[PDB]
Amino acid sequence: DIERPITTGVPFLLVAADARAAGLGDQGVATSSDVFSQQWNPAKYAFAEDAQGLSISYTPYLTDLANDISLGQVTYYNKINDRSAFAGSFRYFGFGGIELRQTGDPNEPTREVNPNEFALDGSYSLKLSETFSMAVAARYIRSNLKVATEEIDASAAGSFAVDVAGFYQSEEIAYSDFNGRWRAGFNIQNLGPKISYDHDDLSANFLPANLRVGGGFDFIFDDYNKLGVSLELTKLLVPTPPGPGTPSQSQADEANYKKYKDIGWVSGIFKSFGDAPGGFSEELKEITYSAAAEYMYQDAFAMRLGYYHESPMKGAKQFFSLGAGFKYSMIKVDVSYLFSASKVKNPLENTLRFSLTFNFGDKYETY
Amino acid sequence: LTTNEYTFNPQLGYISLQQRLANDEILAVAFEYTVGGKVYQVGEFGSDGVDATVVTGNNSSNQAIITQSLVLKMLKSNLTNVKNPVWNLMMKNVYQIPQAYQIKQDDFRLNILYTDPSPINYITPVQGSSFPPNPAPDSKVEQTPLLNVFNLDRLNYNNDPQAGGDGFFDYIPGVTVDVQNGRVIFTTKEPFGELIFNKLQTGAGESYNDPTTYNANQQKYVFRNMYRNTQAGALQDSDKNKFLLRGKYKSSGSNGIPIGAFNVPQGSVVVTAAGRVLVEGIDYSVDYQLGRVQILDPSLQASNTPIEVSLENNSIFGQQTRRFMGFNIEHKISDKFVIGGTYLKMTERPFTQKSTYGQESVNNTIFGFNGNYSTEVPFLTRLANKLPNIDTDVPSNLSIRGEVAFLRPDAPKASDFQGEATIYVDDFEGSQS
Amino acid sequence: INQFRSNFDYNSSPKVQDVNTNFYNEIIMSNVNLVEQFSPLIRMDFELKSSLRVLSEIKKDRALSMSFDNNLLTEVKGMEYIIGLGYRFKDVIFIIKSDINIKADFSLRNNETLVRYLDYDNNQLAAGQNIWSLKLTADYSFSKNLTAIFYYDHSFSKAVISTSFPLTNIRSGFTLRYNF
Amino acid sequence: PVFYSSKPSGISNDDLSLNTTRRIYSRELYPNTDIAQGQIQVVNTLDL
Amino acid sequence: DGLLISVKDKTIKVTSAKENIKEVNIFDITGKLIYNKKKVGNTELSISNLQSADQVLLVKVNLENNAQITRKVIFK
Amino acid sequence: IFGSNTIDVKPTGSVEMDLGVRYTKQDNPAFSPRNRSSLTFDFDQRISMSLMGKIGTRLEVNANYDTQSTFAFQNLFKLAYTPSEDDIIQKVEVGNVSMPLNSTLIRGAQSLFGVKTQLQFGRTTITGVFSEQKSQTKSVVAENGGTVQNFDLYALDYDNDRHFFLSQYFRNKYDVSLKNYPFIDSRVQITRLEVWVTNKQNRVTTTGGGNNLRNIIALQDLGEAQVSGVPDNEVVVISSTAGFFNNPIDSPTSNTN
Amino acid sequence: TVRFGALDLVRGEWRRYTGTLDANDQNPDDDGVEFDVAAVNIQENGTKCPVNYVMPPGVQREQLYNNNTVINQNEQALAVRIGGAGLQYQDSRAVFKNVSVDMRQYKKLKMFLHAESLPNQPTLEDDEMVGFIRFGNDFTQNFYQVEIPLKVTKTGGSCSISPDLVWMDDNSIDLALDLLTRMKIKAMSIDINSSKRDVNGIYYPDNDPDLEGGDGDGKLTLGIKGNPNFGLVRNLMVGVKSRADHKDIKGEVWFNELRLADLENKGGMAAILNVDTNMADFATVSATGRKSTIGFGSLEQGANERDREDVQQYNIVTNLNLGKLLPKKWGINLPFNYAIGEEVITPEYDPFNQDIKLDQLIRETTDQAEKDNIRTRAIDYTKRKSINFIGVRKDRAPEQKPHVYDIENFTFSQSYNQVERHDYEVADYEDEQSNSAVNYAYTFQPNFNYLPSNISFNTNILRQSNRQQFREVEVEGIGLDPLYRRNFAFNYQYGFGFNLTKSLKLNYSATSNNIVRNFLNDDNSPKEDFNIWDDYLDIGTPNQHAQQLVLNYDIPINKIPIFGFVKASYSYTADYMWQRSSTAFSEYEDPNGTVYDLGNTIQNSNSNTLTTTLNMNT
Numbered sequence A: 001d002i003e004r005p006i007t008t009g010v011p012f013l014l015v016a017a018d019a020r021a022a023g024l025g026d027q028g029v030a031t032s033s034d035v036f037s038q039q040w041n042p043a044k045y046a047f048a049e050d051a052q053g054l055s056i057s058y059t060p061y062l063t064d065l066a067n068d069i070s071l072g073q074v075t076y077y078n079k080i081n082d083r084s085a086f087a088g089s090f091r092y093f094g095f096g097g098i099e100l101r102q103t104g105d106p107n108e109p110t111r112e113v114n115p116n117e118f119a120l121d122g123s124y125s126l127k128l129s130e131t132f133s134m135a136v137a138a139r140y141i142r143s144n145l146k147v148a149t150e151e152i153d154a155s156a157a158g159s160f161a162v163d164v165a166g167f168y169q170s171e172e173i174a175y176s177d178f179n180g181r182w183r184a185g186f187n188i189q190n191l192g193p194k195i196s197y198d199h200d201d202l203s204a205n206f207l208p209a210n211l212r213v214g215g216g217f218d219f220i221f222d223d224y225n226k227l228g229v230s231l232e233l234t235k236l237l238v239p240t241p242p243g244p245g246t247p248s249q250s251q252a253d254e255a256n257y258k259k260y261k262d263i264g265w266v267s268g269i270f271k272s273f274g275d276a277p278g279g280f281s282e283e284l285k286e287i288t289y290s291a292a293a294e295y296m297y298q299d300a301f302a303m304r305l306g307y308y309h310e311s312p313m314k315g316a317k318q319f320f321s322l323g324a325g326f327k328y329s330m331i332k333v334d335v336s337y338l339f340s341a342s343k344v345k346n347p348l349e350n351t352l353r354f355s356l357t358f359n360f361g362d363k364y365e366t367y
Numbered sequence B: 001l002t003t004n005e006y007t008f009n010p011q012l013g014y015i016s017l018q019q020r021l022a023n024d025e026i027l028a029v030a031f032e033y034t035v036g037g038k039v040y041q042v043g044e045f046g047s048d049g050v051d052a053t054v055v056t057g058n059n060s061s062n063q064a065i066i067t068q069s070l071v072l073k074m075l076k077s078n079l080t081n082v083k084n085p086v087w088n089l090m091m092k093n094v095y096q097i098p099q100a101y102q103i104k105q106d107d108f109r110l111n112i113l114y115t116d117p118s119p120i121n122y123i124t125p126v127q128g129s130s131f132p133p134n135p136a137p138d139s140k141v142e143q144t145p146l147l148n149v150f151n152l153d154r155l156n157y158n159n160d161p162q163a164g165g166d167g168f169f170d171y172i173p174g175v176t177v178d179v180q181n182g183r184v185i186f187t188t189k190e191p192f193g194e195l196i197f198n199k200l201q202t203g204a205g206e207s208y209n210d211p212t213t214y215n216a217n218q219q220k221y222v223f224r225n226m227y228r229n230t231q232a233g234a235l236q237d238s239d240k241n242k243f244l245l246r247g248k249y250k251s252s253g254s255n256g257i258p259i260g261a262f263n264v265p266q267g268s269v270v271v272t273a274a275g276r277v278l279v280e281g282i283d284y285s286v287d288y289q290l291g292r293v294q295i296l297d298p299s300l301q302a303s304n305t306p307i308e309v310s311l312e313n314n315s316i317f318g319q320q321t322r323r324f325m326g327f328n329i330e331h332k333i334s335d336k337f338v339i340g341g342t343y344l345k346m347t348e349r350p351f352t353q354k355s356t357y358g359q360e361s362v363n364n365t366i367f368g369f370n371g372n373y374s375t376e377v378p379f380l381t382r383l384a385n386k387l388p389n390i391d392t393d394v395p396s397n398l399s400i401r402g403e404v405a406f407l408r409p410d411a412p413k414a415s416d417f418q419g420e421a422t423i424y425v426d427d428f429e430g431s432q433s
Numbered sequence C: 001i002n003q004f005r006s007n008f009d010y011n012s013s014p015k016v017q018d019v020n021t022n023f024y025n026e027i028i029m030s031n032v033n034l035v036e037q038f039s040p041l042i043r044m045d046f047e048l049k050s051s052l053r054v055l056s057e058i059k060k061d062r063a064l065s066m067s068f069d070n071n072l073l074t075e076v077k078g079m080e081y082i083i084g085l086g087y088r089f090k091d092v093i094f095i096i097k098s099d100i101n102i103k104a105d106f107s108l109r110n111n112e113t114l115v116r117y118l119d120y121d122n123n124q125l126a127a128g129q130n131i132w133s134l135k136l137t138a139d140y141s142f143s144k145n146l147t148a149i150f151y152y153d154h155s156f157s158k159a160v161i162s163t164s165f166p167l168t169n170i171r172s173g174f175t176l177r178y179n180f
Numbered sequence D: 001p002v003f004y005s006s007k008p009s010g011i012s013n014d015d016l017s018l019n020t021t022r023r024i025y026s027r028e029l030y031p032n033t034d035i036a037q038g039q040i041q042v043v044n045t046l047d048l
Numbered sequence E: 001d002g003l004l005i006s007v008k009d010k011t012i013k014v015t016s017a018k019e020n021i022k023e024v025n026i027f028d029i030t031g032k033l034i035y036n037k038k039k040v041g042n043t044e045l046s047i048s049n050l051q052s053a054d055q056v057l058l059v060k061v062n063l064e065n066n067a068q069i070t071r072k073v074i075f076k
Numbered sequence F: 001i002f003g004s005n006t007i008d009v010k011p012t013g014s015v016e017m018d019l020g021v022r023y024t025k026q027d028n029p030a031f032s033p034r035n036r037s038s039l040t041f042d043f044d045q046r047i048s049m050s051l052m053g054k055i056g057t058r059l060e061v062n063a064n065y066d067t068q069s070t071f072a073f074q075n076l077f078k079l080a081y082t083p084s085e086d087d088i089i090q091k092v093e094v095g096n097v098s099m100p101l102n103s104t105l106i107r108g109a110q111s112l113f114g115v116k117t118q119l120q121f122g123r124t125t126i127t128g129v130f131s132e133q134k135s136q137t138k139s140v141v142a143e144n145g146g147t148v149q150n151f152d153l154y155a156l157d158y159d160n161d162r163h164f165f166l167s168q169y170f171r172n173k174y175d176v177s178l179k180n181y182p183f184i185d186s187r188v189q190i191t192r193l194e195v196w197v198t199n200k201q202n203r204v205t206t207t208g209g210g211n212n213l214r215n216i217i218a219l220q221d222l223g224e225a226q227v228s229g230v231p232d233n234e235v236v237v238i239s240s241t242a243g244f245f246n247n248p249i250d251s252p253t254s255n256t257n
Numbered sequence G: 001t002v003r004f005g006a007l008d009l010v011r012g013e014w015r016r017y018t019g020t021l022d023a024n025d026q027n028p029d030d031d032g033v034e035f036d037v038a039a040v041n042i043q044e045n046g047t048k049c050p051v052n053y054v055m056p057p058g059v060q061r062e063q064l065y066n067n068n069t070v071i072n073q074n075e076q077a078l079a080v081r082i083g084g085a086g087l088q089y090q091d092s093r094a095v096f097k098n099v100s101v102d103m104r105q106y107k108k109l110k111m112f113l114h115a116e117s118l119p120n121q122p123t124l125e126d127d128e129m130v131g132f133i134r135f136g137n138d139f140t141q142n143f144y145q146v147e148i149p150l151k152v153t154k155t156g157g158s159c160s161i162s163p164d165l166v167w168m169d170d171n172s173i174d175l176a177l178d179l180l181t182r183m184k185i186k187a188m189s190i191d192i193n194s195s196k197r198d199v200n201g202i203y204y205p206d207n208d209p210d211l212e213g214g215d216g217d218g219k220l221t222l223g224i225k226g227n228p229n230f231g232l233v234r235n236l237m238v239g240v241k242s243r244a245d246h247k248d249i250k251g252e253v254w255f256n257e258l259r260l261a262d263l264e265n266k267g268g269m270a271a272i273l274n275v276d277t278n279m280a281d282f283a284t285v286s287a288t289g290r291k292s293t294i295g296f297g298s299l300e301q302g303a304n305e306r307d308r309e310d311v312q313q314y315n316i317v318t319n320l321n322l323g324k325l326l327p328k329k330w331g332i333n334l335p336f337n338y339a340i341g342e343e344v345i346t347p348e349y350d351p352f353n354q355d356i357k358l359d360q361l362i363r364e365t366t367d368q369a370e371k372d373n374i375r376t377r378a379i380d381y382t383k384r385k386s387i388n389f390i391g392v393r394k395d396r397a398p399e400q401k402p403h404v405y406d407i408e409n410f411t412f413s414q415s416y417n418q419v420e421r422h423d424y425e426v427a428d429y430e431d432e433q434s435n436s437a438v439n440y441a442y443t444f445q446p447n448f449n450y451l452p453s454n455i456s457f458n459t460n461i462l463r464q465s466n467r468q469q470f471r472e473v474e475v476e477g478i479g480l481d482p483l484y485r486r487n488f489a490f491n492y493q494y495g496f497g498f499n500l501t502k503s504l505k506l507n508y509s510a511t512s513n514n515i516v517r518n519f520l521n522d523d524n525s526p527k528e529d530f531n532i533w534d535d536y537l538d539i540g541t542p543n544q545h546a547q548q549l550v551l552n553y554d555i556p557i558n559k560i561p562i563f564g565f566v567k568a569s570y571s572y573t574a575d576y577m578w579q580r581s582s583t584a585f586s587e588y589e590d591p592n593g594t595v596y597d598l599g600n601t602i603q604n605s606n607s608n609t610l611t612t613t614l615n616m617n618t
């Protein structure tokens, strides 16, 4: 099964929050520019066709059990010029309002608590060349998922992260049968100090530092049909926790865990490459992949197929994804569904992720 | 307790609580009853008892407070002790019918069987011994139904006495049945104890309170430990809990058959009367929003035939993911002959690799071939035209529908241990709370 | 009188006094309830020509219950002040002009339960509640489809008996609604 | 937790490291137990 | 809407006002059935048997009239 | 590939988005000083959207997404691609598909989420489906109207700690008085009864049948007389019965026994 | 300073079985044997001193998703500790549980067992302590027992021992259930008083000198006492027994992963044929024939939900419009329904012993009478027949004046249902029900008026006869005495409304139910040779009689021009009910011998109501 998963705080930053990318097997680092392109690759916000856009995305958790347990996302991008763009997103995973009762009296003031976890980030994307752009994002993540009881403190844990992204989009190049387009992208996310839920410097957890590298090609037929095939590789930049032992019986495990936890995040990013008995053949296992194909008709109908595969020994989240997107006049509606293919129960099964985006402002031509 | 928190039997002198006392809670009573012209009181009421408090003096500096207590009768003690007579005051002959609120006659069947291991409705003597000779007519045990053995069958349908009974449970709304609570009360306080002990008794040397004096027939059927000890204590006597009260009750409430679901998908309800599938537009009607099924066939309503209604309800939660796949051929040989080759496969995805008993996953496959042939038969119409007073012209029709299906079941590879389909009776991970 | 009944001790027998040296009564009861309710005690509802409507209401109730089993008087008192203001600012300019509908709801509920002994001063405060609340909402229609509602609810519940703790709940913020 | 998170006046770090006053984490007592991120990670012992 | 859920101390008391409880299902945030009582038929319920490895647990109760009502509670 | 280029996919309904702050302060002296007040950010969505339309007279799109109800039978998504009658493919269905079967042994599934396709080779119709089932089977038996519920109890499964005899007299008279039921050979008529239990509610209310709180001392042997067929020590707990009884051996239960 | 990192009261689902399991001891509450039951976890007992707890080879921790995080579930085993003085030579200690397990669809029962010696105690030797599973209906009379000597894991060195040396495959129980079936069949021929039984009566094939092959398993020892059933395992028990003659063994045994493996996935077949014909809107014949083999079922049915029985059923329904056989000038609605059918069900397993296949038991009987009895008692045969004449009435003419004596106002409904059954529980079951209903209704159309506005009347004859004879499962030689229930009833309710004045309205109704007691002798004994059609038009003695009378009067006081504002209104509902007491009351006999009549019961009810508007104006 899963052997030595990476223990990183605020894991909800690694969960797809938009229906479009979730229908592509949780990839957005090399796809076409869109409003939701903040969690994946802000560097293509400068390549957006519209002046500004807003988007609300919903991902329910435990749909069969109860409502109000969901991850929502609000994104807003605006490009002032053709070379620069400011964007801001806010993700919020919450269980909803929960009442606290310890008495059966109908007339009794009940305290309502909502254990939540949100991340507010703002990004600036600058188009350096005519086909290449960079982006810098700053994110603040707060977690208040615990309820205050006796001898338990529900003080929220906060942290900061820095994301560096780059996106390249070549011009439309004609071929024998079609005039396709090449896209590529890289993104290093969640670069920041450790977040401590216990508010103690001795017990701090690494931020889920991530590295995404993706590339895609678009086949264009009849000037109104598009088929974009993209592939993304994702790897965590956090050192792997020790397994059996790398020096009595429990003393070795305790020493290895203490050595692992006493590593700075700056040093840990570079220590991510290695720190395991296996070589490059076993180090390639740490890279998960996602391959997607999106069909666009009249720039108003979108049918997305995706396949996202992680390693069976860590994470073990392999699934297929279907998605649909419709634009009536200025509002794009995206719906995505997930078909699990792993031995572990995916909490996103039987969940129809939703996304609704409004695009407004002047129109910018795409090179 | 408020009057709506308990009930009592005025004649038999017992009480039933709305909520049971499974803890150290103390139960005390004060009751007054009448026998003819005599009135007997056993407790102290708030109307005739002493005052709650008596205060002597004018100011708190010299005031004396005397708080007086009512003297009542204890039915349940603070500390459980089966060796005291207060333990005997609890009734152990009342059985709560599950999900029963308004059980009524003609819609309630009850029987007593002896599972060893199969359900048998009579008691056989132990090998090397026999039941007492020349038994009383009300004490028949040899080849006697268990309803008559436990004094639950001595009346006919109209509650009139009968020699050997009518073979059905005696429904008395005040003696044997609690109608408003759906409870069945035996006519003896220890039906599986002293009653069957006396039925099998062969002499005066055998005493019920001394289990060492039994006659090897009371050592098998007399469950004394369920009355002299608690249920957890009686669990140690496993070879005695062999009597099964098996029955059924009909719940209607209002007109229509409650299918236990709401907003069911259209066409998901299949109704079978006596092996044949009824017509959704002719034989019955379905209100999907309220989940009601109304039988519209005049003959089927007053038929007593058990009707099986199957439906698909999507209001489910905490269920394993089901993958349903397959194809269906619909070849058409002629304008009136259709051949189909439906093939389907349904697999389930368990939450973990350990499937506990009851939460089992399936990997079933079913493939079938069917043929439909609907033809016009003018011969039947012409034959009917030869009847005395029939001159209709509607065509007569015949329809033959055959179908052969094969089911190949299997278990998913996810819930397999060492290559074999594994179901865990007990993995010991749920014990030790 | 929820349950009165005849007394068997009230008969022709020479025994006329109980253990408390009281003459037996022909009719015996356990509780007698005097319920009083001003619902409302007063309601002033007036609308001004400036689109301002004010609805104020004071409600009161008493639930006296005399119990002869313990000879105790359980008195439940309740008071409730409700105030509601509705105003409509006309031609509020953000190129965008719209009316602002402001609704304010203030409430103050005081509930008290006392158990009184007759022979001496033993007024016991069995239970209590003191909750005030203030809900402000302000609507603003930027367009026919896009509307924004600013909401602010502030509810403070004081403790009357030590079994309960004071509770302050302050929800505030905005709600954007887009219609299609 | 006020003794561990928001250091009160008069309490030094030496007083918080004695094995009778130090904070106990779940990894110390249950190293094989996996706890979801953001939940309780400390063992709130009962000290007599 | 008719139900008064309460979690005082390691117990979940369920009371149905003017209705009868049929079944109570208790789920953790993972989605695991930590408790199931398929057969009660009583106004008052007192579980007092949860393990509750986490704090927020989901309970789903249906009454005699098939009224599926779910109310999230925090385990205390 | 499509009949036309017209797309009339129209949305309807409403969407709501609430952003705010929740501040909660409870004055519990046992709480930590760090738990003096909880200030959290609240974000809520109320998506109530429907989306009905067509794409090129070949695609039919029907969607209903509302986050205020059970998603198992309320959130619907349907894409229907219907080519011309002369094409090999007659229907491609994605989303809430159904698999009706005109057979009794092989029942289809009405609520499925997945891909359904239909091909027609001249006269042979092949309907394929691959989906996830969102429903469960349920079978009931109804006789003479309402449904039939079967119960299988055991002897040890009696209703414990709920039913109590009022006295040992009633317990020892129960068997004899019901020998000839429905006739009860007993003239006893319980006219008044008050029951007291341990008070753990510790709540005072006037609407709960009055506030009748009294000090109670319950005696186990109160009102107990002898029994002809039952020895004394099975009726009373008093160690010595010398002079305890002052009534005949078969006296009904009363305070003076 | 004492810091409790955890402090719990721990309760277990396995109860410590109190009471002796061997008859040689007879005093379990002695010997000073400290028997304890607890659990060993991978999360709490991974650093245990004698042997560190490790999962059995091949066992993996369950993995779930709590909140975007993979959480490994705890793996636990049941630990049984025997210490103090130690077990006697044959004394055993076990923990039991109440379950309900049907293991007839699985071939193997598997379990992991581990043995170790207690620290600071004499070392436990191999083949001394034996792990046994006892499952069935009880632990003393009817059970299968599977015993295995335990190899003791060597301790003394490092506390961390590899899982293969902890959960040895030699101590693992892997029992094929066909061995249990064969042992049960063999023990069927072994008398309870035979010398092949032990002191406790358990029959061990391995200890039978006259049996070849033993119990069929070289590693496990099998035993059976009282014909148990693994198709419904009510009681389960796991424990430790001893084998050391002159010793008292102390040690700890871990039980883990008691499971069922090797599912029997043989399929099944079913066939359905329907012939539905309609003939000139006069005849409708629907014949259905179903034949299903063992193992057939739905896609979603589980292992134990599939049909373990062969079903052969058919049902023919015939609907006739007999009224069309008559001229249409005087229309007659006379529908006739004839629904016959029958089903035969042959169980896969013999109903007796509940776990042996019917074919296997029949073949391995060697007794023609017993073979015939087993074959015949297993068959569940049901036959239903229904004849219906419901809705018999004469339709109104296109232009006819309604009249009170018109026959068109009458409606007739006849129903006859007959059910014949015989299965493992009943050797013969007869259920006849006849319902005859005649309904009449009329609505009249236009000192006080005496012409009623409507007349209501309907009669019902409901006869039900049930004959139920239970079978003797041992032999089909005598059987039990048949039991007869009869519900011959005669119910008739009538009513009428009167409109004496424009304000008055008098609705009267009266229902009467009588019971026919022509099937009883002088004593309370039914007659066996009685037919349900003996005296059909017989009115029985009264059993219940209800009357209702509702009067409404608007009090036209406005006629006098002094009270023209009063709007008084009076309603009076009177109900009467006479209920016949049971024969136990009407013919009660005291022990002195005198017969007393306790009489019937009467009930009366009034519902007076007055409503006045009393407008003070005008």
Ligand SMILES: CCCCCCCCCCC(CCCCCCCCCC)(CO[C@H]1O[C@@H](CO)[C@H](O[C@@H]2O[C@@H](CO)[C@H](O)[C@@H](O)[C@@H]2O)[C@@H](O)[C@@H]1O)CO[C@H]1O[C@@H](CO)[C@H](O[C@@H]2O[C@@H](CO)[C@H](O)[C@@H](O)[C@@H]2O)[C@@H](O)[C@H]1O
Residues within 6 Å of the ligand: A054, A056, A076, A330, A358, A360, A361, C142, C143, C144, C145, C146, C176, C177, C178, F015, F016, F017
């Ligand atoms: C951090 C986010 C801040 C929030 C941004 C809200 C922007 C609101 C502008 C409304 C809008 C955007 C659609 C947004 C809808 C998403 C709502 C989400 C709800 C979630 C649940 C809808 O406009 C569309 O909708 C129609 C409404 O039916 C309009 O019809 C008509 O609508 C009315 C006349 O427009 C008539 O009165 C009505 O009669 C008609 O029918 C049409 O004009 C149009 O199709 C049009 O945008 C345009 O308006 C201006 C106003 O100054 C905005 O100026 C910007 O303001 C700052 C930007 O904030 C920037 O800094 C600033 O540089 C920039 O000058 C621009 O945006 C501009 O392009």
